[PDB]
Ligand binder design. Structure first.
Ligand SMILES: N=C(N)c1ccc2[nH]c(-c3n[nH]c(-c4ccccc4)c3O)nc2c1
Lengths: 151, 254, 96
């Protein structure tokens, strides 16, 4: 079994998909996601994909910091374990949706009561848009990402 | 228990205290009225075998209130694979001479099914660990039962996060790590044999036995616990067997 | 599909174009980049214990079954357990 590597969060408007490598040769993967104090939840069970949508989990609380890990199993032997009697895995980067998700009123993927909440509902009377003085959304308190693409 | 809290009386009903000649030996966990799970290494130096006692319903070691129940330990069964003085396969199954009576203060901890423990309980983040051991390394043992909520780790992460040089054995598949590496919270001397108990959907299960660590709350280190899922089969088989004679029995493992 | 004009969002989802990329907004019962995974199809024991309160057993070509510990019996809904005894293991009487 080879461990996954290059675990990466691709996220735009809270639609969050973890991606990783390699393309599996006779191997399958499962992902677990948690917040730092929460329990691990499994997703994309025994997939041959190298991506896993995690939107559903991260929009529950977009202000948490999630960590994800990817397990590698022999396809067929989904009960594989290394010397520690545990399946091989690799961790992702930490991801705090609210501070790292790329920006694209516009509904985001964050749902409240199944309806989607829009950008302004998630960022409050605290989100601002550049005109020149072409619009660009900016979240000026961000360390990363901060400005959207232009319109 | 370093950095824990006093377990309110009765909120840890499965906690056992083992005494040899009246002197505290180790903790233990009640899995039903006549069977107690503790750690094998607690028995490395036992000579007065008749003088081994288990107390249930205990809380405050200084004041006897009505709730304590003491039973002589009729037999101590340890894996044929445990080597005295080492830390691997550190589990002991104790047969009490007569059953305890379950009460609001004496209740067994559920020994979970292996697959449930492995695919579900092993991924509940926090579990409680407990005992009357030292409240700081080389510090005073406690008088009232202490309980500590510790987060568990997969061994890759434990080995990635731990510093090498110190008395640290291999973390085998028969062990897991839980705790904190910032020097604040851990189990300690006097807590061996005691429970690591996981809550899942309203019930509590036995996932580990307090076993060993580098000091107690040493920075760059975690507490190490016997991974009980590896022994469920062995436990249940033993508890169904006809009593062999002998106080100490080394039962075949697997 | 490929980018939005080529209808990438399966199972009734709505596509939304980005810089050549898109975002699929799924319906409540689906997830995945293309709304392809049906939430309803993963009732397996590795998945949130199969919804069972205590023990879970997957079965070949048939629905998993939930089970309980000694001292407990499975309830009508096929997932919950109830104590059949006075002092069921793993319960703390002064907090019950
Ligand atoms: N850092 C920890 N997580 C830790 C936990 C339990 C310990 N138990 C002990 C321990 N040190 N010596 C003995 C002992 C107990 C009874 C008989 C013989 C040795 C112990 O149980 N050190 C311990 C350290």
């Amino acid at each position: 079994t080879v461990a996954a590597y290059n675990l990466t969060w691709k996220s735009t408007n809270f639609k969050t998909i973890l991606e990783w490598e390699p393309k599996p040769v006779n191997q399958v993967y499962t992902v677990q996601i948690s917040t730092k104090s929460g329990d691990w939840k499994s997703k994309c069970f025994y997939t041959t994909d190298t991506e896993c949508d995690l939107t559903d989990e991260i929009v529950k609380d977009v202000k948490q910091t999630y960590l994800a890990r990817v397990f590698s199993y022999p396809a067929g032997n989904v009960e594989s374990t290394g010397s520690a009697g545990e399946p091989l895995y690799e961790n992702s980067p930490e991801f705090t949706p609210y501070l790292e998700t790329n920006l694209g009123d516009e509904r985001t993927l964050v749902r409240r009561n199944n309806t989607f909440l829009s950008l302004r509902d998630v960022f409050g009377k605290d989100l601002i848009y550049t005109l020149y003085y072409s619009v660009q959304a900016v979240i000026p308190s961000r360390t990363v990402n901060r400005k959207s693409t232009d319109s | 228990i370093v950095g824990g809290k006093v377990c309110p009386k009765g909120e840890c009903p499965w906690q056992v205290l083992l005494l040899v000649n009246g002197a505290q030996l180790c903790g233990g966990t009640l899995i039903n009225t006549i069977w107690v799970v503790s750690a094998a290494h607690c028995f490395d130096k036992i000579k007065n075998w008749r003088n081994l006692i288990a107390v249930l319903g205990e809380h405050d070691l200084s004041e006897h209130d009505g709730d304590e129940q003491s039973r002589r330990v009729a037999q101590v069964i340890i894996p044929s694979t445990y080597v005295p003085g080492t830390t691997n396969h550190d589990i002991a199954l104790l047969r009490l001479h007569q059953p305890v009576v379950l009460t609001d203060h004496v209740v067994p901890l559920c020994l979970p099914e292996r697959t449930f423990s492995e695919r579900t309980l092993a991924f509940v983040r926090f579990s409680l660990v407990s005992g009357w051991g030292q409240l700081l390394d080389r510090g005073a043992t406690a008088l009232e039962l202490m309980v500590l909520n510790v987060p568990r780790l997969m061994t890759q992460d434990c080995l990635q996060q731990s510093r090498k040089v110190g008395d640290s054995p291999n973390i085998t598949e028969y062990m897991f790590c839980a705790g904190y590496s910032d020097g604040s919270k851990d189990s300690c001397k006097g807590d061996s044999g005691g429970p690591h108990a996981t809550h899942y959907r309203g019930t509590w299960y036995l996932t580990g036995i307090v076993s060993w660590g580098q000091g107690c709350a040493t920075v760059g280190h975690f507490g190490v616990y016997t991974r009980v899922s590896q022994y469920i089969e062995w436990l249940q088989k033993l508890m169904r067997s006809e009593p062999r004679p002998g106080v100490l029995l080394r039962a075949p493992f697997p | 599909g490929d980018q939005c004009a080529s209808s990438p969002c399966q199972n009734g989802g709505s596509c939304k174009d980005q810089l050549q990329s898109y975002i699929c907004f799924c319906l409540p019962a689906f997830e995945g980049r293309n709304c392809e995974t049906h939430k309803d199809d993963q009732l397996i024991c590795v998945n949130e214990n199969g919804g069972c309160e205590q023990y879970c057993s997957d079965h070949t070509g048939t629905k998993r079954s939930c089970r309980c510990h000694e001292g407990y019996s499975l309830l009508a809904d096929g997932v919950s357990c109830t104590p059949t005894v006075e002092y069921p293991c793993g319960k703390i009487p002064i907090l019950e």
